[PDB]
Design a protein around this ligand. Structure first.
Ligand SMILES: *[C@@H]1O[C@H](CO)[C@@H](O[C@@H]2O[C@H](CO)[C@@H](O[C@@H]3O[C@H](CO[C@H]4O[C@H](CO[C@H]5O[C@H](CO)[C@@H](O)[C@H](O)[C@@H]5O)[C@@H](O)[C@H](O[C@H]5O[C@H](CO)[C@@H](O)[C@H](O)[C@@H]5O)[C@@H]4O)[C@@H](O)[C@H](O[C@H]4O[C@H](CO)[C@@H](O)[C@H](O)[C@@H]4O)[C@@H]3O)[C@H](O)[C@H]2NC(C)=O)[C@H](O)[C@H]1NC(C)=O
Ligand SMILES: C[C@@H]1O[C@@H](O)[C@H](O)[C@H](O)[C@H]1O
Ligand SMILES: [Ca+2]
Ligand code: NA
Length: 419
């Protein structure tokens, strides 16, 4: 497996401040291909300057040929909170509508949707008038809508879209799911699916494949990040209403964080494992978790694999030259190709200030990690475009640079693989 071409585009100038607002691990998602177009979303500085930002949405044609980016600016909502939690997630439903949810740390929902199905009936002009106003509810559904953190979207097989988030606070919170119907244009409440017990679950993402929805998490006792413990797993066969553990045992609804039947690896507190890293369902149905810990005596990225035959294994990701991350270092992701044979680790290196792309293969039980490429000069939690990789064999990664304002740019890097 080799890289056929590498290309990069500078798409904006990152915002000034001591927190990272663009390129955050739990943006789900930031960079999405739908049909012939790729879409991206990020904050840029508004005319009032420091600590005033607008959401931008970019699109470019990627098929049959790659075209230039064009951007619209949503200049009717000013983001003003210098807090790295307050990121943007985007999702696209099967009616072609683009959904955005943004700017939360324990506050009421901020959500908006396109007026028409602009990712399906593609408009000639890309302007802010394409979007409806910001609202603080999900029409058709019910609250609670506050205090919300961590909006995540997941598209489903019939064109519907899940929106998932935490209600509560660090160290005491629950998680909820809502479902948007592409046929009716309405949301509906699926309710609380994980319930804290004087703690909160931090999921790594949502992964959907062939009618099943998968998630993994750790449990945090207090606002101190050293108090994460455990690696947990569950899946649903009905889009989030009914959940099962790794042994196919039906769970209570909601799942309590005090129920150990979802535990797949005992990791104590003070292991230097961080919440909200990465996960992946590969196209062969194997489930992968990316975390980190110090338990071997060195800081290392860790790969948890759920095999076909229910087994779980844990193996360090330690290719030559990769510096292992501590608790507060940037978080990575796992990507997979359409065939299910290739697993990509998109791993930020906290010493080199770069993002490494590593590959392992199912034929070698994913133990053959090799360097494939590097993105230099990054201070980012890398994010990638799942659909573009599956459909085109192009690994497309959104990054925030290292460096100081206003030199620090936002970029998309495309690695064309000879898959
Ligand atoms: C339902 O699903 C669950 C989840 O998959 C499943 O439970 C697993 O069952 C398998 C097989 O029965 C167990 O696998 C064995 O584990 C042996 C010891 O496990 C210990 O270590 C686990 C890993 O943590 C270690 O390392 C981390 C650092 O990475 C560290 O933090 C830990 O302290 C620890 O050192 C750990 O998760 C596990 O903890 C469970 O058990 C303890 C009590 O023992 C409990 O207190 C915990 O809360 C938790 O329940 C435990 O501490 C291991 O020695 C053994 O290896 C032998 O067999 C393999 C064959 O595969 C050989 O390769 C090897 O050479 C040895 O001969 C084997 O790997 C696994 O531990 C269970 N996992 C959990 C979370 O319980 C249930 O069986 C399923 N039930 C049904 C009905 O299907
Ligand atoms: C460790 C800490 O945990 C949560 O508050 C968020 O994920 C944040 O981004 C991370 O820095
Ligand atoms: Ca996802
Ligand atoms: Na608590």
């Amino acid at each position: 497996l080799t890289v056929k071409s590498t290309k990069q585009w500078t798409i904006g100038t990152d915002v000034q401040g001591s927190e990272r607002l663009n390129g955050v691990s739990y943006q789900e998602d930031a960079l999405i291909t739908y049909g012939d177009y790729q879409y991206v979303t990020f904050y840029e500085t508004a005319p009032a300057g420091y600590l005033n930002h607008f959401v931008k949405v970019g699109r470019r044609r990627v098929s049959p040929s790659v075209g230039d980016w064009e951007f619209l600016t949503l200049d009717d909502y000013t983001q003003k909170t210098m807090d790295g939690h307050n990121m943007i997630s985007m999702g696209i439903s099967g009616d072609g509508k683009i959904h955005l949810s943004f700017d939360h740390h324990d506050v009421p929902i901020n959500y908006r949707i396109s007026k028409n199905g602009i990712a399906k009936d593609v408009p000639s002009k890309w302007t802010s008038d394409l979007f409806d106003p910001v609202v603080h509810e999900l029409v058709g559904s019910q609250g609670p809508y506050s205090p919300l953190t961590y909006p995540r979207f997941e598209p489903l097989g019939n064109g519907d879209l899940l929106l998932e988030f935490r209600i509560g606070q660090s160290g005491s919170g629950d998680s909820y799911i809502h479902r948007y119907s592409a046929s009716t244009g309405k949301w509906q409440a699926y309710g609380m699916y994980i319930q804290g017990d004087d703690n909160n679950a931090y999921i790594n993402g949502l992964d959907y494949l062939d009618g099943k929805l998968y998630t993994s998490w750790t449990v945090r006792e207090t606002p101190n990040a050293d108090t994460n413990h455990g690696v947990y797993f569950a899946y649903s066969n009905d889009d989030g209403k009914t959940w099962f553990n790794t042994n196919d045992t039906k769970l209570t609804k909601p799942i309590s964080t005090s129920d150990d039947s979802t535990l797949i690896w005992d990791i104590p507190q003070n292991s230097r494992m961080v919440n909200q890293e990465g996960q992946l369902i590969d196209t062969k149905g194997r489930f992968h978790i990316l975390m980190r810990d110090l338990l071997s005596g060195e800081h290392q990225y860790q790969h948890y694999l759920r095999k076909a035959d229910g087994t779980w294994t844990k193996n360090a990701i330690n290719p030559a030259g990769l510096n292992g991350p501590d608790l507060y270092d940037p978080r990575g992701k796992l990507a997979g190709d359409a065939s299910g044979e290739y697993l990509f680790g998109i791993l930020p290196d906290p010493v080199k200030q770069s993002t490494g792309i590593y590959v392992a293969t199912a034929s070698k039980d994913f133990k053959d990690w090799k360097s494939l490429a590097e993105i230099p000069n990054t201070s980012t939690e890398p994010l990638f475009d799942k659909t573009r990789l599956h459909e085109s064999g192009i690994l497309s990664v959104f990054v925030r640079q290292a460096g100081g304002f206003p030199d620090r740019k936002l970029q998309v890097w495309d690695f064309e693989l000879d898959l």
